[PDB]
Design an enzyme around this catalytic site. Structure first.
Site, PDB file in Angstrom:
ATOM      1  N   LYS A 170      46.250  24.071  48.527  1.00  0.00           N
ATOM      2  CA  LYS A 170      44.838  24.075  48.790  1.00  0.00           C
ATOM      3  C   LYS A 170      44.144  23.433  47.607  1.00  0.00           C
ATOM      4  O   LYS A 170      43.211  22.657  47.781  1.00  0.00           O
ATOM      5  CB  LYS A 170      44.337  25.497  49.030  1.00  0.00           C
ATOM      6  N   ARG A 184      20.638  40.579  41.852  1.00  0.00           N
ATOM      7  CA  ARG A 184      21.265  41.012  40.610  1.00  0.00           C
ATOM      8  C   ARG A 184      20.188  41.802  39.854  1.00  0.00           C
ATOM      9  O   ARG A 184      19.002  41.708  40.170  1.00  0.00           O
ATOM     10  CB  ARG A 184      21.690  39.802  39.776  1.00  0.00           C
TER      11      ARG A 184
HETATM   12  N1  LIG Z   1      39.570  47.714  43.577  1.00  0.00           N
HETATM   13  C1  LIG Z   1      39.423  48.350  42.411  1.00  0.00           C
HETATM   14  N2  LIG Z   1      40.527  48.787  41.770  1.00  0.00           N
HETATM   15  C2  LIG Z   1      40.380  49.434  40.610  1.00  0.00           C
HETATM   16  N3  LIG Z   1      39.267  49.730  39.944  1.00  0.00           N
HETATM   17  C3  LIG Z   1      38.188  49.277  40.601  1.00  0.00           C
HETATM   18  C4  LIG Z   1      38.178  48.596  41.809  1.00  0.00           C
HETATM   19  N4  LIG Z   1      36.881  48.283  42.189  1.00  0.00           N
HETATM   20  C5  LIG Z   1      36.142  48.773  41.218  1.00  0.00           C
HETATM   21  N5  LIG Z   1      36.870  49.381  40.217  1.00  0.00           N
HETATM   22  C6  LIG Z   1      36.379  49.998  38.980  1.00  0.00           C
HETATM   23  C7  LIG Z   1      36.398  49.034  37.791  1.00  0.00           C
HETATM   24  C8  LIG Z   1      34.968  48.518  37.805  1.00  0.00           C
HETATM   25  O1  LIG Z   1      34.569  48.060  36.523  1.00  0.00           O
HETATM   26  C9  LIG Z   1      34.192  49.769  38.165  1.00  0.00           C
HETATM   27  C10 LIG Z   1      32.807  49.523  38.715  1.00  0.00           C
HETATM   28  O2  LIG Z   1      32.880  49.116  40.078  1.00  0.00           O
HETATM   29  P1  LIG Z   1      31.666  48.371  40.792  1.00  0.00           P
HETATM   30  O3  LIG Z   1      32.126  48.037  42.162  1.00  0.00           O
HETATM   31  O4  LIG Z   1      30.433  49.187  40.612  1.00  0.00           O
HETATM   32  C11 LIG Z   1      31.217  46.725  40.009  1.00  0.00           C
HETATM   33  P2  LIG Z   1      30.881  46.301  38.215  1.00  0.00           P
HETATM   34  O5  LIG Z   1      32.210  46.044  37.600  1.00  0.00           O
HETATM   35  O6  LIG Z   1      30.013  47.383  37.673  1.00  0.00           O
HETATM   36  O7  LIG Z   1      30.111  45.017  38.218  1.00  0.00           O
HETATM   37  P3  LIG Z   1      28.925  44.853  39.109  1.00  0.00           P
HETATM   38  O8  LIG Z   1      29.390  43.953  40.194  1.00  0.00           O
HETATM   39  O9  LIG Z   1      28.604  46.173  39.711  1.00  0.00           O
HETATM   40  O10 LIG Z   1      27.736  44.477  38.300  1.00  0.00           O
HETATM   41  O11 LIG Z   1      35.028  50.402  39.167  1.00  0.00           O
END
Ligand SMILES: Nc1ncnc2c1ncn2[C@H]1C[C@H](O)[C@@H](COP(=O)(O)CP(=O)(O)OP(=O)(O)O)O1
Ligand SMILES: [Mn+2]
Ligand SMILES: [Mn+2]
Ligand SMILES: [Mn+2]
Ligand SMILES: [Mn+2]
Ligand SMILES: [Mn+2]
Ligand SMILES: [Mn+2]
Ligand code: NA
Ligand code: NA
Length: 326
Positions: free
Chosen positions: A63, A140
């Site tokens: 890709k 944002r």
């Molecule tokens: N699939 C996953 N596996 C493991 N850990 C996971 C995860 N999704 C979220 N996390 C954990 C780490 C993120 O820093 C934290 C916050 O998750 P979040 O979805 O609030 C996003 P953030 O990193 O704060 O940036 P932003 O987009 O909100 O501004 O939750």
DNA sequence: CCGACCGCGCATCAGC
DNA sequence: GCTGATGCGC
DNA sequence: GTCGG
């Protein structure tokens, strides 16, 4: 963003596989490949160059070769065009609507904001709120406004009990100019592994944040987790700030550092860590750091007084929150 | 060449 | 009514 | 979709 065009491509592909195809592992796969390239220090001149990296296999190099050559991806034009794929894709941007729900609506002709508007009485409380703040939620948050929120949260928490340690995390703790939302890690002396379970440790604070009128809506509220909606107050007769997403999790005191690590991410970072901590002989989770025995048994939870402490256990260069954005 | 890739806290609702 | 089944966001 | 087994 030397390879920005490639990682954007990889990202759309991800959302597709996750929203339309309902294949969470392809999603992760693309999601991973992108983070790897988006961290390569050179400008990818071919798919083979990219194929050297772990996470970029044959299909992505292929890709990548097209994107580089042509300048677009045929497979994505198709997606972008196909009405159904395109519609399910849209719906999922509403909070409360995941693959399954979006796929259902579309199959019943509901495929746009207006449709959700017409069939509103066919949405759960969470989906209503989702639709209600659709535009707001995709905005944002200026790192400055976060600060003002990090002030009202941290403050109001004190007013319930000066022992609460509310720590704002997420990409915000990672020091980011803006954040998708506000993630709050919460702790209290009366709550640890043992606890005997303190009823309403989270209730009181959730409540108090609704008292001043900072939290305007509830998407979900349990004994240790709250997903909701908040809004910075407005001067006088200016313009309401956009309604923002807020998550608050009450974690046991002796797990703080381990939870503060998890909740700071980045998510892909956490995928990275909860992966190299296995080649070292451990098993991280959002709550503890455990060693792996012979067959691989959940050894007792190792003591932890710092995030750095967790890195040590897995022999990884300590990385500050700002350098964990992966 | 095939199978693992975090699974958890909460809300809702099909089936009874 | 209760509850196992599942969906959702992270 | 990838990569390790
Ligand atoms: N699939 C996953 N596996 C493991 N850990 C996971 C995860 N999704 C979220 N996390 C954990 C780490 C993120 O820093 C934290 C916050 O998750 P979040 O979805 O609030 C996003 P953030 O990193 O704060 O940036 P932003 O987009 O909100 O501004 O939750
Ligand atoms: Mn190099
Ligand atoms: Mn219509
Ligand atoms: Mn966040
Ligand atoms: Mn969050
Ligand atoms: Mn296979
Ligand atoms: Mn139940
Ligand atoms: Na590779
Ligand atoms: Na959604």
């Amino acid at each position: 963003t030397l390879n920005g065009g490639i990682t954007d491509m990889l990202t759309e592909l991800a959302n597709f596989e996750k929203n339309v195809s309902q294949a969470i592992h392809k999603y992760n796969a693309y999601r991973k490949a992108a983070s790897v390239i988006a961290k390569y220090p050179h400008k990818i001149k071919s798919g083979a160059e990219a194929k050297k990296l772990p996470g970029v296999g044959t299909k992505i190099a292929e890709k990548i070769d097209e994107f580089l050559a042509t300048g677009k991806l045929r497979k994505l034009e198709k997606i972008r065009q196909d009405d159904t794929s395109s519609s399910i894709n849209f719906l999922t941007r509403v909070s409360g609507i995941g693959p399954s729900a979006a796929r259902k609506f579309v199959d019943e002709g509901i495929k746009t904001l207006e449709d959700l508007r017409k069939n509103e009485d066919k949405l759960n409380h969470h989906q209503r709120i989702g639709l209600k703040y659709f535009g707001d939620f995709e905005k944002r948050i200026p790192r400055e406004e976060m600060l003002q929120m990090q002030d009202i949260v941290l403050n109001e928490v004190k007013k319930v009990d000066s022992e609460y340690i509310a720590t704002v995390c997420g990409s915000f703790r990672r020091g980011a100019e803006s954040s998708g939302d506000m993630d709050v890690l919460l702790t209290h002396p009366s709550f640890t592994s043992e606890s005997t379970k303190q009823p309403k440790l989270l209730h009181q604070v959730v409540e108090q944040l609704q008292k001043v009128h900072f939290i305007t809506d509830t998407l979900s509220k349990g004994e240790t987790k709250f997903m909701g909606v908040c809004q910075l107050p407005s001067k006088n007769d200016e313009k309401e700030y956009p309604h923002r997403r807020i998550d608050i999790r009450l974690i046991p005191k002796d797990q703080y550092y381990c939870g503060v690590l998890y909740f700071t991410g980045s998510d892909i970072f956490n995928k990275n860590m909860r992966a190299h901590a296995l080649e070292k002989g451990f098993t991280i989770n959002e709550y503890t750091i455990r060693p792996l025995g012979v067959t691989g048994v959940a050894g007792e939870p190792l003591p932890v007084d710092s995030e750095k402490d967790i890195f040590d256990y897995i022999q990884w260069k300590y990385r500050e929150p700002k350098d964990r954005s992966e």
